[PDB]
Design a protein around this ligand. Structure first.
Ligand SMILES: C[C@H](O)CNC(=O)Nc1ccccc1
Ligand SMILES: C[C@H](O)CNC(=O)Nc1ccccc1
Length: 435
């Protein structure tokens, strides 16, 4: 496994112990063999759980999710997927990792896809070894994999709106339920209905995940309402998953705008991970998985794979060579390797628009490749009339950095900057020059 030129997919079923049992064995072996190693966690929550599994072992934690005093002698680095790719985009000396370990390696956010592409390319070049840990590798077709204890699988109509009758089984349940919704806004409406019905609800999404996930440990709850972020190794003490089996898909239309298409079916991988939240306790058989639709391979044509190519085109590898996407996910996007390579100053703008600007990759690329500098926000206001962003059914307005009240009307429209109240608030702050 640890030998150079080898990429290993550790595809044990969900809950089989990849993170708590196998990972520490690999790390002890890597240290014995003096292999410089990186461990990539999908989330800060997983990074902290890895610290518990790896406690005692000399690991440098490159995350403020862990409070450790390092020795400076560690040859094993641990960071989130996004941090790895983020540092690769910056003028930062990159250690030669002989061994590259990615946990929850099914994660489809652009920076995770890019990290797999960089790593697998280095393995293909004979420069390194890699281990990708996931029950659901790219292209998996089995939504119902093995579990630690038997699961009751039931195809059932699942509400996606508030309801007054017809779904008694949802609220008649006395255990804890994890409910996967297609979007934050959808989750808000279901959560309000459950709260009105007397349930205690916690809501999880990408921007709130680390903070809100702690509440699943610190307080009593009946329902966790979550987007697909909880597919990435989030552990709950639950006995039921309700799965809409739906997600939103960012889709680039006519190379000029990004829409959030759907809700549409999840992939088999996603469905298996959603289901995989339960059936984890061999002493508690009969956890329930209620699913409200079929699976489809909706990662095909999904903007994240094009965005991953934008990131990798702007990461140095060797001379003019450019890292390929990991082979099993390399034909998901029509994309020409190298087509998004930016010159020095535009590439720095691109990085800053993602890092400080917090803009989606695709949108950051449009701005940077247009030769616009980071602090120049005129593009947020000079788009066509159908790019007007709406707030409470009237055009959203901000005061520009010049002190002028203007309608938010970006030259490039990416629906992710206004998909919920929090997103729009952050984009308004950006348009105003506030970061
Ligand atoms: C997101 C991360 O917190 C940012 N970077 C780090 O923490 N970097 C780091 C920490 C310890 C040793 C060497 C490097
Ligand atoms: C003190 C340690 O060597 C810090 N480790 C790293 O800086 N790791 C790193 C740097 C660039 C890209 C990806 C990963």
């Amino acid at each position: 496994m640890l030998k150079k030129k080898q990429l290993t997919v550790l595809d044990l079923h969900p809950g089989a112990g990849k993170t708590r049992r196998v990972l520490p064995e690999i790390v002890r072996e890597a240290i014995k063999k003096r292999l410089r190693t990186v461990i990539l966690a999908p989330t800060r929550v997983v990074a902290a759980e890895m610290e518990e599994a790896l406690r005692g072992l000399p690991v440098r934690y490159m995350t403020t999710a862990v409070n450790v005093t390092h020795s400076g002698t560690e040859i094993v680095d641990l960071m989130c997927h996004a941090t790895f790719t983020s540092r690769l985009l910056q003028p930062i000396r990159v250690p030669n990792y002989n061994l590259n370990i990615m946990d929850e390696a099914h994660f489809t956010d652009p920076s995770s896809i890019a990290a797999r592409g960089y790593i697998s390319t280095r393995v293909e070049m004979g420069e390194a070894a890699a281990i990708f840990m996931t029950a659901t590798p790219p292209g998996t077709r089995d939504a119902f994999p093995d579990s630690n204890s038997p699961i009751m699988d039931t195809e059932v109509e699942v509400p996606e709106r508030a309801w007054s009758s017809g779904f008694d089984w949802v609220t008649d349940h006395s255990g804890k339920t994890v409910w996967f919704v297609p979007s934050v806004r959808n989750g808000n409406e279901i959560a309000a209905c459950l709260t009105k019905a007397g349930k205690r609800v916690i809501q999880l999404s990408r921007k709130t995940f680390e903070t809100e996930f702690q509440k699943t440990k610190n307080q009593e709850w009946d329902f966790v309402i979550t987007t697909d972020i909880s597919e990435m190794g989030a552990n709950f003490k639950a006995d039921r998953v309700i799965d809409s089996r739906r997600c939103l898909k960012p889709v680039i239309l006519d190379g000029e705008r990004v829409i959030l298409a759907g809700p549409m079916p999840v992939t088999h991988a996603s469905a298996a991970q959603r289901r995989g939240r339960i059936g984890r306790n061999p002493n508690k058989p009969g956890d329930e998985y209620m699913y409200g639709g079929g699976c489809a391979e909706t990662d095909e044509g999904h903007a994240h794979w094009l965005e991953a190519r934008m990131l990798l085109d702007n990461i140095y590898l060797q001379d003019g060579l450019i890292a390929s996407l990991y082979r099993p996910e390399a034909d998901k996007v029509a994309a020409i390797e190298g087509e998004f390579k930016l010159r020095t100053e535009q590439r720095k703008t691109f990085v800053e628009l993602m890092k400080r600007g917090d803009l989606p990759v695709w949108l950051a690329y449009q701005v940077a490749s247009a030769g616009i500098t980071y602090t120049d926000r005129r593009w947020c206001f000079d788009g066509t009339t159908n790019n007007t962003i709406m707030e409470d059914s009237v055009p959203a307005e901000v005061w520009t950095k010049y002190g002028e009240k203007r309608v938010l009307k970006p030259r490039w429209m990416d629906a992710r900057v206004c998909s919920d109240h929090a997103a729009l608030k952050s984009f308004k702050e950006f348009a105003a020059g506030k970061r």
